[PDB]
Amino acid sequence: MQPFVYMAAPARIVFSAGSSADVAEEIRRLGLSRALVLSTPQQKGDAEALASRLGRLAAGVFSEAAMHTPVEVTKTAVEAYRAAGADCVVSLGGGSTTGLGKAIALRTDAAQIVIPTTYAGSEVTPILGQTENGVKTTMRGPEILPEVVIYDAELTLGLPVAISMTSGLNAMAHAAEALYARDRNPIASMMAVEGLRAMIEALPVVRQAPHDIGARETALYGAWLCGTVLGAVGMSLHHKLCHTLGGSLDLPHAETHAVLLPHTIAYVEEAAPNLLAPLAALVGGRAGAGLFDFAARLGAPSSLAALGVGADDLDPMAELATANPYWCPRPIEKTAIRDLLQRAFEGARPA
């Protein structure tokens, strides 16, 4: 056995169809009584309906959560949290809404109850990205990790098919990189394989039947396991490269993960063939190429060109991607990253 360390993060995860009906219970269980419900404008109706059902347990609704968690919006939300006399936030939405709740918690120590409605997995990580003075920053710590997560697959029936597929691939990316983390451990590896198996099973079913509650349950369960390992162990080339491209070119988040994942996994697979073998088995081939074929079954975007990246962006990106050293089982090398970017730009099937 390889030496390892395993650290369980504190967690209270409530999982069941209709569980968002019991948000009141969870507020009370924390000994709290005044929730500020959070959403984007695209989920404002749902946030308002939840607040309504909470009655006196709902202190207010702030429905202006914004892409990339900009600090000026967070300042406004914190003013809303204070004015409402809130003692917690209930974050109803995807990674952008979870990020707003995390940014409010950073500033106020609000307890967080997160009700995730995508597959991003932020709800079980201690990581927070923000935009300040036009630049995306990242940090992590125990004060960011949400206290309670309520997974209610009914709230995902309405997640559109295209974002369901790319967000599902974003989840799979967390699990795939967990398999070869420098601080990999057997529990994170077991959860990663199970999360991959759940997403590979569920996403093709969700594509054909977005209203199928069984398939939605399975995909949400997979998203939870994938987020848990994002929370637990170190990511590598895939997540670093998505952050570089995402940040420098303003690319759509989940789509960037979907496009890059077959190529970043193929890059590492040359060096980590045994660690990626469970993934290769699940995709019925090579880990990188098999992911590409799986993404094609889902109809996900497959080229960086489709995301608005130009051929003249590839050299500057290969430079930025190699500027700051981090660990990978295969060392990051500029020419090899430049080749990876060219294949992802082309939408080529990994070799």
| Nearer to a second copy among residue 189 and residue 218 (C-beta) | 218
Which position among 159, 188, 225, 291 is part of the footprint of ligand NAD (CB under 6 A)?
A: 159
The two three-digit tokens of residue 213, written as one number:
């509650």
| DSSP letters for 268-320 | HHTT-TTTSHHHHHHHTS-HHHHHHHHHHHHT----TGGGT--GGGHHHHHHH
Pairing, β 135-140 against β 127-132: antiparallel
Stretch that binds ligand NAD, among 121-129, 276-284, 313-321, 338-346 (CB under 6 A): 121-129
Using an 8 Å Cβ cutoff, are 280 and 287 in contact? yes
Instruction: Rounding to the nearest 10 degrees, give the CA dihedral for residues 114, 147, 69, 41.
Output: 20
Site for a second copy, rule CB under 8 A = 40-46, 48, 61, 63-64, 66-68, 70, 72-73, 76, 131, 133-135, 157-162, 210-211, 248-252, 255, 301, 305-311
At 152, which amino acid appears?
A: D
Which position among 27, 66, 70, 94 is part of the footprint of ligand NAD (CB under 6 A)?
A: 94
- CB-CB neighbours of 212 under 10 Å: 16
Q: Does 93 bind ligand NAD (CB under 6 A)?
A: yes
Which among 96, 98, 47, 99 is positioned nearest to 67, based on CA atoms?
Answer: 96
Q: Is 118 annotated as a binding residue?
A: yes
Per CB under 6 A, contacts with ligand NAD among 213-252 are: 230
Using only C-alpha atoms, the chain has a radius of gyration, in whole angstroms, of 20
| Nearer to a second copy among residue 42 and residue 138 (C-beta) | 42
Cβ 68 to ligand NAD shortest distance, Å: 5
The two three-digit tokens of residue 177, written as one number:
């990189």
| Element housing 215 (H / E) | helix 213-232
Which position among 37, 51, 95, 184 is part of the footprint of ligand NAD (CB under 6 A)?
A: 95
Q: Is 134 annotated as a binding residue?
A: no
Annotated binding site for NAD(+): 40, 42, 95-96, 117-118, 125, 127, 155
Q: Which residues bind ligand NAD (CB under 6 A)?
A: 40, 42-43, 67-68, 93-97, 99, 117-118, 120-122, 125, 127-129, 155-156, 158-159, 163, 167, 230, 253-254, 308
The residues that touch Ca ion, with contacts defined as CB under 5 A, are: 143
Binding residues: 40, 42, 95-96, 117-118, 125, 127, 147, 155
